[PDB]
Amino acid sequence: SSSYITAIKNSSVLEQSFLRAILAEFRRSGLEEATFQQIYSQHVALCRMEGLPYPTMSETMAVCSHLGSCRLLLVEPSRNDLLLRVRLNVSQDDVLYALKDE
Amino acid sequence: LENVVLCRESQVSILQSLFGERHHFSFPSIFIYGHTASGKTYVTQTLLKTLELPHVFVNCVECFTLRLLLEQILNKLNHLSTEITCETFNDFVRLFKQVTTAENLKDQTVYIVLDKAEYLRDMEANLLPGFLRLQELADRNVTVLFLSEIVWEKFRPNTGCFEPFVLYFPDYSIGNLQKILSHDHPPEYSADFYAAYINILLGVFYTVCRDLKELRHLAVLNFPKYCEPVVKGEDTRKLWRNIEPHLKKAMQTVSAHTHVELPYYSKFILIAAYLASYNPARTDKRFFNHLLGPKPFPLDRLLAILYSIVDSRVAPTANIFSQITSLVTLQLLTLVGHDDQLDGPKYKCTVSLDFIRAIARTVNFDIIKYLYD
Amino acid sequence: TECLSQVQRILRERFCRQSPHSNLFGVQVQYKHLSELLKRTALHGESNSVLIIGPRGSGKTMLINHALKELMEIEESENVLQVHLNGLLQINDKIALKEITRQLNLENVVGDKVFGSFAENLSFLLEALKKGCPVIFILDEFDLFAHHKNQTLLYNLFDISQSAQTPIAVIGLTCRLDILELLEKRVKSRFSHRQIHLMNSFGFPQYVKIFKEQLSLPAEFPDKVFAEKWNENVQYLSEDRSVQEVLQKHFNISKNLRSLHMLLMLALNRVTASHPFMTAVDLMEASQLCSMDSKANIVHGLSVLEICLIIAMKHLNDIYEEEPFNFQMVYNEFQKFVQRKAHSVYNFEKPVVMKAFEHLQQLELIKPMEREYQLMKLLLDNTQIMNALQKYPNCPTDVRQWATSS
Amino acid sequence: GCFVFKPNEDYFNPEDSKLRFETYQLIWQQMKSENERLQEELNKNLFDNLIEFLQKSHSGFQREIPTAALVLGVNVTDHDLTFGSLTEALQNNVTPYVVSLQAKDCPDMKHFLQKLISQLMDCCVDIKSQKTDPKMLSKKRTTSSQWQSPPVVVILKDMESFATKVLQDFIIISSQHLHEFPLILIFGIATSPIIIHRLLPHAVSSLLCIELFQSLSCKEHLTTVLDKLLLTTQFPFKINEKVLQVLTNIFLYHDFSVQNFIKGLQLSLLEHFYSQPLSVLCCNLPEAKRRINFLSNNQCENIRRLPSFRRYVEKQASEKQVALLTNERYLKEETQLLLENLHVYHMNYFLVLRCLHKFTSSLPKYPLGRQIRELYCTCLEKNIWDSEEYASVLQLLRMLAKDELMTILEKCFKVFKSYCENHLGSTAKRIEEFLAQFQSLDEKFEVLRENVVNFIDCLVREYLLPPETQPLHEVVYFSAAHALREHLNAAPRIALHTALNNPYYYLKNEANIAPDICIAYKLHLECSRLINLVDWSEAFATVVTAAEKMDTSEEMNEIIHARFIRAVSELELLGFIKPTKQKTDHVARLTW
Amino acid sequence: QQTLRNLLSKVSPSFSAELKQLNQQYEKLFHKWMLQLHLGFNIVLYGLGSKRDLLERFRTTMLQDSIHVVINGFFPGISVKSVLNSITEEVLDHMGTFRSILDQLDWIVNKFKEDSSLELFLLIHNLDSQMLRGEKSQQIIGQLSSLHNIYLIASIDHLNAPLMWDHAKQSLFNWLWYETTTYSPYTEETSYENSLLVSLPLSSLTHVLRSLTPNARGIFRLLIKYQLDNQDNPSYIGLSFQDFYQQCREAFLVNSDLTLRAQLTEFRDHKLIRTKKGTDGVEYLLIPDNGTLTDFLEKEEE
Ligand SMILES: Nc1ncnc2c1ncn2[C@@H]1O[C@H](COP(=O)(O)OP(=O)(O)OP(=O)(O)O)[C@@H](O)[C@H]1O
Ligand SMILES: Nc1ncnc2c1ncn2[C@@H]1O[C@H](COP(=O)(O)OP(=O)(O)OP(=O)(O)O)[C@@H](O)[C@H]1O
């Protein structure tokens, strides 16, 4: 079986909204690259919509290194810190099925 | 060594509590960030000197290679013999178990204090996550105490690591900066009067630098200058109104002359290099914003504008080309094609305009309408 | 008393050393999958080489050491010769060979000839062991292990695990997900595939139970009355909804079961001076000392010349947008603001303004990508500065009007 | 392909080689030795201040680290000599712990520390009679417990070519523990102390103690070495004004260095000793009198037949011309007193030239010459009283007659009152002749009339053009300007332009016959915007089709194409056209 | 190339007598060179035609007694490592140290100060080339030649040939400059460089492979893997220096920024990595085909 959808299925809430921010920016741009402040703005919008508290980017970068450690996405270093160009390691319909199934 | 705290008591207390007594385990790794003013080795050294938790202190500025960093850790540790050699990391984890088996330090939580870890950040990729897991790597009751200038968020290895417990040592507050910037040790005055001086000086001066070291330096400079007309003339308000006239200029003043004699063709070379750097949107044809900086331009354009500036007896000798190479070693010109080839790349100008004005005016040339207008 | 030092000693080890506490939760099926495989590779000469993948901070090392201890309890010491490696220490092949020499007590025979083919080297290690026999290879931090120059200690282990048939388990402990795709194709096609574990977390209402079973004083008795009093206090704090509120807040940032250890560790550091039974508010401030905004602590501490400079950089985004700027445009914007203002307090002259830059570069809020008037890059958010300027305690009115102008 | 062969002195080449070469070696070795002594004298006022400053900043040690940033000149050529002298001075009057770093032997920190401790180990192990950092401190603790713990100083030679990282790390390491190991670094800033703020960020720049020093601005260094080296009576070999003009121009315009000037004077001396067979008696006067009296007779015919002496033949009477033409015994006698007159002309020339220099440097705006160098120039290019510049001095000197002129007549008279008996015998006894004029200086008309007779006697008597006034002057003077200038400062970018545009060497080629490559370049730059390959090959084929028919077409196309491609590889090779990649083909006109 | 060079020198260079005479002007100039070189000068001579045969005739007529290291500069095998290596073995009659270039530089300096009248002087054809120059490279020749006991003679061919000497670099060898012209075509350069009418084969990459550190070999393993794995993507415009820095740093091949930049610029010398500037201004890196790039590290790992 494939590891990645089960990793998304047992991810936390802010990770799932981070992947939703990733797909929202990838629907906006169309590209496979995105910088961290763009998906951070998308993540701020989604945490606003869900009634969650404010996503500080210490937490958002901790969760970005969480998802980059587990290779659901492909990362730039934490030294660049706002200028991280992220690619998505899995295809988009896979993560749409992963957050669509429930 | 004298005052342990000077009113930063809660962070001191939670760190002191976090150490615990000796026979039980503590944290693996503790990271402390904060500003460079903020006492981050004052507080921990006066904390560690009190209880005498048997510790090793290092600076990673000192150890520029990995072997010296392991060597001084193991050599300072075993005193608490010969140089107990370790070329590699696994040698350090091997010899650490033999070193930490003595009755001074068998049960005691050994602290390996690491200062200015941002230089350790580019030592290797191995050593930082290897150092963060030392409590279960060697399993010998260790707590590696980090302190750094930089945030932890850039400091992580982008694989993840054992995330340390992270403290923020706070910056000093204003009334705390009245108190702890030497309300102790005034030699000859009342402490009220030296506090009155520095209370006047600080509230003026709390907008440029909150660094305690240089403010201690500036205070011990401009306090005897303040202190002389009290003990000579004789009322704090009048000499407050005298000391701030000196304080504005002492602020402004903390670079002899910009003019440098040059050989004559070198003067004309960098005159031509400035003039082809600062308005060069193909305005070669006319005579013969500014704020973004110097635009790059190739060598033959520089030689053509050199021929236009100088009296026409110039020959392209070996010495004028050797001189144009030797201008770059003195960093008055820069090649921005770093390796494009030996043939003449874009040479961009890197000297200020007033210096250029002085070099142009010392050989009969007014150029400011000629330069960008 | 006896109680406070004893509860801190017995709770601190399973707290922050991650000592072997016997309760394990969410992992029973993966453990029971591992155990019979380990029993039949250990009891018999056959060699199968399982692989485990999970996230950092959860699972792996606790599971393999717990299964290790429970297997070591069964005798016939069975002459299983375990060997612990890590990916971090043994970076190269020459270190790895001598480390296997170290663990397997080989230096009675001297072996002092560096052989060319390292299959002969590994087979000699196993050969001189075999005439002297099971081994269990615990290959921790496999993702760093997969960056050898020639992948020797990856591939020769798999070749010997299929070919020498000395009892072997190559148990790889990884952290990144693609251990197969990062693995080179001769080894990944060779013998990487024994059955692969996956490791993940579980639901929040059982995670409150794992908080309670983590925090409770154990079946070891320091003093049984204090055990009953304190774990009843653990349950009374556990049923209170503010602890549940901060624990749900901790769940959505962290499913990790390592962050819970630290979050609870700060709370237990607070408790033994007075009120040995603690509050939900004490857990709340223990969560609060685990910070959320690392950058407001940096920006909040800075003096106001750096403040008006960094809001000038923010203003450099809000005209002539998206270039990596240099010093001169920052100087121009600062001068245009200070000429908009009437007072001559803050018209600080040119070499002072460079000092704020070369202090500010050390904080890495500004990035280098010529030497002093070039191409500097900002890595920051507006809104943390907008919150920081109202939290500045001695914030002057003119930089406040600069903030409202923006 | 660097193949080595293993093999498995007094050759110079009339002008016979042995005493010629020994005369060369004597003159140049003497000149170089006195050059080094006169180098080390001038910097004493500079670095004996530095000994005071370093002694004061060491002795108050019971947070700071002292730096003394020298501002040396732009001449990197002679920076070794000042540092050798300063190393000598600081080694003698302060500590025998002086090391220097070069900024080319340490790109990073391990090299820095290893070469520093190796230099320190040899410097301590000589005068008492290892990658580690704190062992250097342990070396300081062992090796000098006593003698008031003398401070180890390092000498960074180039501040500028150091990278900032290794320098910052070293200053923070040294400033961390200077409790033991007091270190006082002295980096030689090549430009100006502005750039120590540029190369050092503010935390490390705030760590220390800056006290800058000047250095000798090089114009009043070369006035000393030109003034002592050739303007004296002492050294037997003078120089022509035109060759000197070439040497001083390539000083003052391009190079701004003095070691290059001494290389130019050495080359002039060498080429003079190659050139002419009468150069052998370039000596002092009894050493001249040694073998004037015995010499080969064809060189004595050469002493008859060189053109300055034949000018002297033209001005003289027949009854001694008939015996002095050919016979050696009288030719020795007249040439000996001619060489004595040469020394006489030098000795009465130079001291009154210095007198005129002091009398002219006193003037407002100094219209004749700025310094002592150019006064040699203005009295030899034009005739001096013919020229308008000494006319401007003479027009100036009338109404300048006040007590400034009398006071500086007294002052210039005092400085050549030191040179009164430093001349010690004058060739007209002009010291006490002019001093007999100059002794009424203590007792406003008299300054005017005394001025008139002094400059008239002075300048009309001796201050004349040395070639025409003096026969046998070729022996002392060397003159070949644009022979030398191309040896010392050549121009290949003019040489290729010349030999490519006009490759006429001596049959008909000046404005099609005997290039291949100049045909290629000339035809390249007859279509002078840019070029593509095939049409350029056809144009070259057209012009050597003309060359062929001014003395089958497919074999001719083959050989024309082959010699075309042999030409075009060189025209790429020699700094012209750069290959235009990824297109079909073209060439790019890279030099206009 | 070969069938192109069969037609070379078929019939008739259009002058021979003045070429023989113009070269025959310069044979009188040689004892001046020997004396001038004995005093410690250094002769550069430039020209428009081939003058290495004049230097060969010079070394035949006057260098039958002394050591000469005839360093060709035209074929791409020679770098200054080979200069120091051959001058260590084949001149000093024993091998030297091996750790670094500066160590053998200082050591070969150190051998000559004690051994008087050893009297070795090399001479270099084509001192300016694509391979010979460099601030690491030329300064070793300079520091070598600055001594009393070593007398180099060179030839420069380029139009920008005195661009690679600062005054401090120029003060190491006392230059004086001769003018020559021969008009002979430079047959060795034009032979052994290239011809355009017909990339790099395996031999020079094996020679760089055998003269570099194994960590540099592991570095170009990474770079050639990232090149070969994205060969048919026309948007792949090369890795950045920062991306290659971190992907080199993850496999522990190099420690610092400056070490990797120095390795990059000494591999940029060999023309097996080219820098391209994109619209950011940041230099990306791509080397000059794909099928010749799999043969090496196919065979470097069997
Ligand atoms: N609370 C305090 N009371 C008295 N002096 C203090 C206090 N805090 C800091 N200092 C001064 O600061 C110096 C120590 O500097 P500090 O501890 O700030 O270094 P640091 O924070 O480690 O520096 P960096 O962060 O740059 O490594 C001491 O010498 C002392 O003079
Ligand atoms: N199911 C579980 N049962 C008991 N403890 C657990 C469980 N999951 C996680 N933990 C705790 O989480 C931490 C896991 O540490 P461990 O080293 O075993 O895994 P890991 O940290 O992911 O591995 P690595 O050290 O390679 O990152 C330990 O504190 C362990 O006590």
Numbering used by the authors:
A (entry chain A): 760 to 861
B (entry chain E): 4 to 83, 91 to 244, 249 to 268, 295 to 328, 349 to 433
C (entry chain D): 14 to 89, 91 to 146, 152 to 388, 396 to 432
D (entry chain C): 9 to 16, 27 to 31, 37 to 85, 98 to 164, 193 to 506, 548 to 615, 625 to 664, 669 to 709
E (entry chain B): 269 to 466, 471 to 560, 562 to 575
Paper quotes:
The origin recognition complex (ORC), composed of Orc1–6, is a highly conserved heterohexameric complex, which plays a critical role in recognizing origin DNA and promoting helicase loading. Each of the Orc1–5 subunits bears an AAA+ or AAA+-like domain and an α-helical winged-helix domain (WHD). Among Orc1–5, Orc1, Orc4, and Orc5 each contains a functional AAA+ domain for nucleotide binding; in contrast, Orc2 and Orc3 only contain a RecA-like subdomain with no predicted ATPase activities. Away from DNA, metazoan ORC resides in an autoinhibited conformation with a closed and constricted central channel to preclude DNA binding.
In order to acquire sufficient ORC samples with ORC1 incorporated, an additional high-salt incubation was applied to cell lysates to release ORC from chromatin. After this treatment, the amount of purified ORC subunits, especially ORC1, was substantially improved. While ORC1-WHD is located in a similar position as seen in previous ORC structures, ORC1-AAA+ is not as stable as that in the crystal structure of DmORC. In State I, in addition to its interactions with the AAA+ domains of ORC4 and ORC5 as seen in DmORC and ScORC structures, ORC1-WHD also engages with α3 of the HTH motif from ORC2-WHD through its β-hairpin motif. These interactions also induce noticeable conformational changes in other ORC subunits. Additional domain movements can also be observed on ORC2-AAA+ and ORC3-WHD, rendering a slight enlargement of the ORC ring. The weakened interface likely permits ORC2-WHD to sample more conformations. The interaction between ORC1-WHD and ORC2-WHD induces the transition from State I to State II, which is likely the first step of ORC activation for origin DNA binding.
